[PDB]
């Protein structure tokens, strides 16, 4: 199914070599701002995150007070929430540390969602 399954940590740790190290989290952010976006700006809003997040949560995620994220910030809010999704430790995350168990935080910056099957 491709586009619909380019969709989690499970698109950048299908390997479970051990974890996502930051290079694979970076690859999850770049994948996610692509498949999130139907107005075609990668600048990420109350109808991009349609049913994903409240318009109040939408203005949590961003740093520079747009009220919304960017192709810069679905690539940087991910990395700012990277260490925090792990309860411990330094610079690595297994799916147990991410995929809506223990890291259900950082999910909001890399899970996106699509419009289809
Ligand atoms: Y890996
Ligand atoms: Y948009
Ligand atoms: Y912004």
From Swiss-Prot:
The keyword Cell inner membrane does not apply. The chain holds residues 23 to 133 of 133 of the full protein. It comes from the Bacteria. This is Lanmodulin. High-affinity lanthanide (Ln)-binding protein. Shows 100 million-fold selectivity for La(3+) over Ca(2+). Binds 3 equiv of Ln(3+) with picomolar affinity and a fourth with approximately micromolar affinity. May be involved in receiving and then transporting lanthanides (such as La(3+), Nd(3+) and Sm(3+)) to a specific periplasmic destination. Coiled coil: none annotated. REE-LanM complexes are stable over a broad temperature range (up to 95 degrees Celsius). Residues 13-24, 37-48, 62-73, 86-97 form the EF-hand domain. GO terms for molecular function: calcium ion binding. Keywords: Metal-binding, Periplasm, Repeat, Signal. Nd(3+) 1 binds at residues 13, 15, 17, 19, 24. Monomer. REE-LanM complexes are remarkably resilient under acidic conditions, retaining REE binding down to pH 2.5. Nd(3+) 2 binds at residues 37, 39, 41, 43, 48. Nd(3+) 4 binds at residues 86, 88, 90, 92, 97. GO terms for cellular component: periplasmic space. Has been used for metal extraction from two distinct rare-earth elements (REEs)-containing industrial feedstocks covering a broad range of REE and non-REE concentrations, namely, precombustion coal (lignite) and electronic waste leachates. After only a single all-aqueous step, quantitative and selective recovery of the REEs from all non-REEs initially present (Li, Na, Mg, Ca, Sr, Al, Si, Mn, Fe, Co, Ni, Cu, Zn, and U) was achieved, demonstrating the universal selectivity of LanM for REEs against non-REEs and its potential application even for industrial low-grade sources. The lineage of its organism: Bacteria, Pseudomonadati, Pseudomonadota, Alphaproteobacteria, Hyphomicrobiales. The gene is lanM. Nd(3+) 3 binds at residues 62, 64, 66, 68, 73. The keyword Repeat applies. Lanthanides are essential cofactors in some pyrroloquinoline quinone (PQQ)-dependent alcohol dehydrogenase enzymes in the methylotrophic bacterium M.extorquens. It is found in: Periplasm.
């Amino acid at each position: 199914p491709t586009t619909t399954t380019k969709v989690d940590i499970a698109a950048f740790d299908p390997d479970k070599d051990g974890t996502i190290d930051l290079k694979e989290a970076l690859a999850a952010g770049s994948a996610a701002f692509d498949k999130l976006d139907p107005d075609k700006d990668g600048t990420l809003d109350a109808k991009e995150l349609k049913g994903r997040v409240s318009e109040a949560d939408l203005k949590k995620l961003d740093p520079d007070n747009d009220g919304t994220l960017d192709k810069k910030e679905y690539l940087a809010a991910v990395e700012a929430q990277f260490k925090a999704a792990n309860p411990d430790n330094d610079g690595t995350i297994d799916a147990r540390e991410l995929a809506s168990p223990a890291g259900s935080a950082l999910v909001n910056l890399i899970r996106h969602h699509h419009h289809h099957h």
